[PDB]
Design a protein around this ligand. Structure first.
Ligand SMILES: *[C@@H]1O[C@H](CO)[C@@H](O[C@@H]2O[C@H](CO)[C@@H](O[C@@H]3O[C@H](CO)[C@@H](O)[C@H](O[C@H]4O[C@H](CO)[C@@H](O)[C@H](O)[C@@H]4O)[C@@H]3O)[C@H](O)[C@H]2NC(C)=O)[C@H](O)[C@H]1NC(C)=O
Ligand SMILES: *[C@@H]1O[C@H](CO)[C@@H](O[C@@H]2O[C@H](CO)[C@@H](O)[C@H](O)[C@H]2NC(C)=O)[C@H](O)[C@H]1NC(C)=O
Ligand SMILES: *[C@@H]1O[C@H](CO)[C@@H](O)[C@H](O)[C@H]1NC(C)=O
Ligand SMILES: *[C@@H]1O[C@H](CO)[C@@H](O)[C@H](O)[C@H]1NC(C)=O
Lengths: 195, 213, 217
């Protein structure tokens, strides 16, 4: 505690680094703000011989729990298979989108094994589009109203090739009985937007 | 899975005409919908994506609209090169799916077929089987009925039919119908008839031969 | 520059495994921007989605294929592949590979040329050629090309020198597992005895090439 601003991937000391990884992860201990972007990629869990990077222990992703704000974009293209949601980012409150994936996207979630997103603290995405893509076991994403998180005219979300709404319904994977029409990030009470 | 339905399955038009194709989804897909064009022996080519947005290089007479469950591809004015199959495709939820396709067909002047019949040859008869072939040549439109008759008995389950695609120069179809029997069964009966119905003709036309005559 | 091409055997026996490779040029196959996919189309029929693979390892398959399919990547050749086990005639289809640009247009953009795979137990057999004799303006005659495996045959008339009013039908599968087809031509009556007619049948999987004169009986 309290305020501690850290550089993100592809600026300052990480300017040549492709992903968060086993070598650089420690340097995020106790950051509350990222000044730039977070990239989370397959080479992180695989490791890489050419840059002498060891594989990353998934338990250490939990060092990102303190992070409340990212001034750039968040991009997750790999995640541990036995995590049902993005637990690490449960305290993320703001993605600004001052800088964007391919100039377009400020949040991007691509082909994970998750069954829910889990971003219960997310209240604002200031600029940039959202893309949730190819997550074959993901429910819940169509329940929230994204337009209420947006801050710039022209923001939209592409939610494509994910699990079907019908199959979620048949296995009781909908918002909890006590949520409001505002939707949820998961099956539990503590996951609804408004109470 | 989400089912996609395209009807009519066939449209029949001439060049310069306006074209309106329909596509329906059994569950909602927002605007996550694409249209494809396909010609024989070729892969499909993307026309429109997101309902809505025309792809780079795609001619302006091609355009699309709709949301949720109801979609429409509109060709404001056909060019000879637009005759082909058009498929709709949802990518909103897994598994990804396509519709059955609508085929755009060359409207043409109505033409009754020339009917022809061929006996089996002696050379085939030595081997123990007998094919009788019937030809429907250079006709339009596609709809046709063929009925085989042997000494007046209506044949069932022993014929197979084959149809050409629209002729690249005259736009007609033609059709062959082959009837197969053993040597034994063929030598028991005298009169072999091929009966054709088509809207070009006021009454059905029958060609026949008499075995061995 | 971006280029896709399917390759592999055109023939697989019922109950065995079907295998194909797609090669890619104009960009490395290891990339966050693309799903690498497979789609199939039986002759005369609609499009069916098979699945995809991503550079991260993860995959997605159509449940209609009852866990019979796997895909894999081989960065060593910039290639991805398909296995389908326990095949039957229902697996006959032109097979396509295709790319998806996840951050661009977001649906299939570049496609392969497509490749035909037939599932069947038939052994290869050359065809017989039977004449279709004319008789009763315009006449008609032809050739019945019967009982061969596998496809295709190619037929021409008078060494490719007739060409006009000629019709060659698509082949049909018969109860016996063998294919049958006929080629036809329309001609003037008048000159039925003053002009001679021959059809040229070729079937290259078999080693047989046949010529048959067709005459009025
Ligand atoms: C995982 O995280 C670690 C820690 O962040 C990260 O290690 C870093 O790798 C980069 C790139 O390999 C290193 O930056 C380089 O430093 C070398 C000297 O080590 C310089 O020579 C490089 O210089 C410029 O050199 C070329 C010619 O002048 C330029 O054309 C080019 O742009 C080069 O940038 C370069 O700056 C950095 O030193 C390390 N950091 C540490 C502390 O080791 C690793 O890359 C990450 N791996 C993955 C796969 O995520
Ligand atoms: C990827 O996620 C899926 C879906 O959550 C996992 O499949 C589940 O596995 C658990 C094992 O504890 C079962 O109890 C669930 O019933 C399964 N869900 C169903 C019905 O598919 C899968 O285990 C995950 N994969 C890996 C490698 O961890
Ligand atoms: C994070 O907070 C704990 C508890 O306040 C502190 O002991 C620790 O040193 C901090 N992390 C840093 C900056 O290393
Ligand atoms: C999560 O999955 C990996 C499997 O490689 C394992 O190492 C880890 O302990 C698992 N956690 C669970 C399910 O307790």
């Amino acid at each position: 505690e309290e305020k501690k601003v850290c550089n993100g991937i592809g600026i300052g000391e990480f300017k040549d680094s492709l992903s968060i990884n086993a070598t650089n992860i420690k340097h995020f201990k106790n950051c509350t703000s990222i000044s730039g972007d977070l990239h989370i990629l397959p080479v992180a869990f695989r490791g890489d011989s050419f840059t002498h990077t060891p594989p990353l222990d998934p338990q250490e992703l939990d060092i990102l729990k303190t992070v409340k704000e990212i001034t750039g974009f968040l991009l997750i293209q790999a995640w541990p298979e036995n995590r049902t949601d993005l637990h690490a980012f449960e305290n993320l409150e703001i993605i600004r989108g001052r800088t964007k994936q391919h100039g377009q996207f400020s949040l991007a979630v691509v082909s994970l094994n998750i069954t829910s997103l889990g971003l219960r603290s997310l209240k604002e995405i200031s600029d940039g589009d959202v893309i949730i893509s190819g997550n074959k076991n993901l429910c819940y994403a169509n329940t929230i109203n994204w337009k209420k998180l947006f801050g710039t005219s022209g923001q939209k979300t592409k939610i494509i090739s994910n699990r079907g709404e019908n199959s979620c319904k048949a296995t009781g994977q909908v918002c909890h009985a006590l949520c409001s029409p505002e939707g949820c990030w998961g099956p539990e009470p503590r996951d609804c937007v408004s109470c | 899975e989400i089912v996609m339905t395209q009807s009519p399955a066939t449209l029949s038009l001439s060049p310069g005409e306006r074209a309106t194709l329909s596509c329906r989804a059994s569950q909602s897909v927002s605007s996550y919908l694409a249209w494809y064009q396909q010609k024989p022996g070729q892969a499909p080519r993307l026309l429109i994506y997101d309902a809505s947005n025309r792809a780079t290089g795609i001619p302006a007479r091609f355009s699309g609209s709709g949301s949720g469950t109801d979609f429409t591809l509109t060709i404001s004015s056909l060019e000879p090169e637009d005759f082909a199959v058009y498929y709709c495709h949802q990518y909103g939820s897994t598994p990804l799916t396509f519709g059955g396709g609508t085929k755009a067909e060359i409207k043409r002047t109505v033409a009754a077929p020339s009917v022809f019949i061929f006996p089996p040859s002696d050379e085939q008869l030595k081997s123990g089987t007998a094919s009788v072939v019937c030809l429907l040549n250079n006709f339009y439109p596609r709809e046709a009925k063929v009925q085989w008759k042997v000494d007046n008995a209506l044949q069932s389950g022993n014929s197979q039919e084959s149809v050409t695609e629209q002729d690249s120069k005259d736009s007609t179809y033609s059709l062959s119908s082959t009837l197969t029997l053993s040597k034994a069964d063929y030598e028991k009966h005298k009169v072999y008839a091929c009966e054709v119905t088509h809207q070009g003709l006021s009454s059905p036309v029958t060609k026949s031969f008499n075995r061995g005559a | 520059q971006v280029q896709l091409q399917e390759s592999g055997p055109g023939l697989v026996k019922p109950s065995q495994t079907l295998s194909l490779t797609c090669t890619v040029s104009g960009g490395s196959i290891s990339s966050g921007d693309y799903y690498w996919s497979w789609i199939r189309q039986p002759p005369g029929k609609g499009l069916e989605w098979i699945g995809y693979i991503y550079y991260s390892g993860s995959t997605d398959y159509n449940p209609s294929l009852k866990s019979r399919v796997t895909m894999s990547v081989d960065t060593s050749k910039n290639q991805f592949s398909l296995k389908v086990n326990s095949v039957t005639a229902a697996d006959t289809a032109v097979y396509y590979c295709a790319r998806v640009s996840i951050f661009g247009v977001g649906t299939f953009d570049y496609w392969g040329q497509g490749t035909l795979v037939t599932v069947s137990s038939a052994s290869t057999k050359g065809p017989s050629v039977f004449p279709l004799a004319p008789s009763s303006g315009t006449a008609a005659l032809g050739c019945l090309v019967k009982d061969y495996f596998p496809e295709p045959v190619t037929v021409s008339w008078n060494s490719g020198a007739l060409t006009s009013g000629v019709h060659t039908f698509p082949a049909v599968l018969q109860s016996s597992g063998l294919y049958s087809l006929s080629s036809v031509v329309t001609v003037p009556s008048s000159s039925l005895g003053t002009q001679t007619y021959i059809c040229n049948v070729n079937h290259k999987p078999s080693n047989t090439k046949v010529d048959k004169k067709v005459e009025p009986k």
